[model samples]
Target: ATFKVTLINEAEGTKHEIEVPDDEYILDAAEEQGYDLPFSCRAGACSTCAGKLVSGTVDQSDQSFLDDDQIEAGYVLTCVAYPTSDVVIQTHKEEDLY
Candidate 1:
């Protein structure tokens, strides 16, 4: 099944609603839907695509930055994150996570 992902774009002050399969990357699916999301590293090593979670969880198992505390604070890198549940996340949260 697909999971709902509400990406709150704080920089643009907008919200995007989309759904992708549980194993798919949210940002990749976002691009498929014509949403060019923010990303630089593309790996889990940068804050460029950082998205702070407002609810739900993601199957994000690989990360180079963001220690346990940040992960506990609900920051997920949309580039590598795979949704495990319907989620509400604030996109463009590089500064927020910084």
Candidate 2:
């Protein structure tokens, strides 16, 4: 099945929506729609693609890269984040926030 995904930034006041496959990650969804999201290691280790889930549920493919506080604060690795519902994600987040 395919799902609808929306990425937004309160800081930038920008929003973009894309269609994604059920099994695809948010990063993949963003890229497929031609959005330029910064990333060094797409493997979820570098934290370059790190983002926050402002709304909705996201399933993490792996949590090894994140600490307890990061999770609690909504830090998610977009490269490995899959949505459980229509989601709002914050891109261009500051490192201090996570």
Candidate 3:
């Protein structure tokens, strides 16, 4: 199966649509699509790959990077997230931590 993702950097009003394998992480899709997302570690332990789940749904392959409150706020660790549906994501905002 495959999934569709709409990646948005709301701060810049930038968006891109990407298709990825169901088993692939959001980070993989971003990198494969040539998005320049900042990242230090590809693991969920690092917040560098964090982003906001602006809309739709995703399944976390791992959740250690985010607490319940963070998840409730729509934050996700892209390194560990996979789309469960056509998802809208917001990243690269200069003002906030995802």
Candidate 4:
């Protein structure tokens, strides 16, 4: 299935909209669409691609960088995150994860 993904970069005051398949990682999907979202390690072991889910849900449990509390607070590692619903997320959130 396809899910609408909205990415917001508050520091840059920019927002991007893209379509993500349920089977695809949000970071890969965004990059394929030329969104230039931040990422490193790409294995979910780091917080470089961290973001906050402003709405909707994602499955990113494979990522070990975030604690349960952080995940409950909407933090996700986009590199491993798969949309479970149409999602709105704020990127450039690595700092917040630390």
Model 1 Cα lDDT, one tens digit per residue, 1-98: 79999988876789889988998999999999888888999898888988899999898887677878999999988888999999999888788765
* Candidate 4 to native Cα RMSD, angstroms: 0.7
Would you list the rank order by lDDT, best first?
Answer: 4, 1, 3, 2
The list of candidate 2 runs beyond 4 A from truth reads none
Ranking by TM-score: 4, 1, 3, 2
Off by over 4 Å in 1: none
Ten-residue stretch with the least lDDT total in model 4: 89-98
lDDT tens readout by residue for model 2, 1-98: 66677788667888898877768888888887898787777787767888887877788856458887888888888888888787777886647453
Where does candidate 3 stray beyond 4 Å?
93-95
Q: 57, model 1: CA deviation in Å?
A: 0.8
Tell me the deviation in Å of residue 2 in model 3: 1.2
Model 3 per-residue lDDT tens digits across residues 1-98: 78788888776878888886778988888888887676667777767777888788888858576778878888888878888888888875323553
**Between candidates 3 and 4, the TM-score winner:** 4
In model 3, the clashing pairs are none
TM-score of 2: 0.86
Error of 2 at 11 (Å): 3.5
**Candidate 2's error at 72, in angstroms?**
1.6
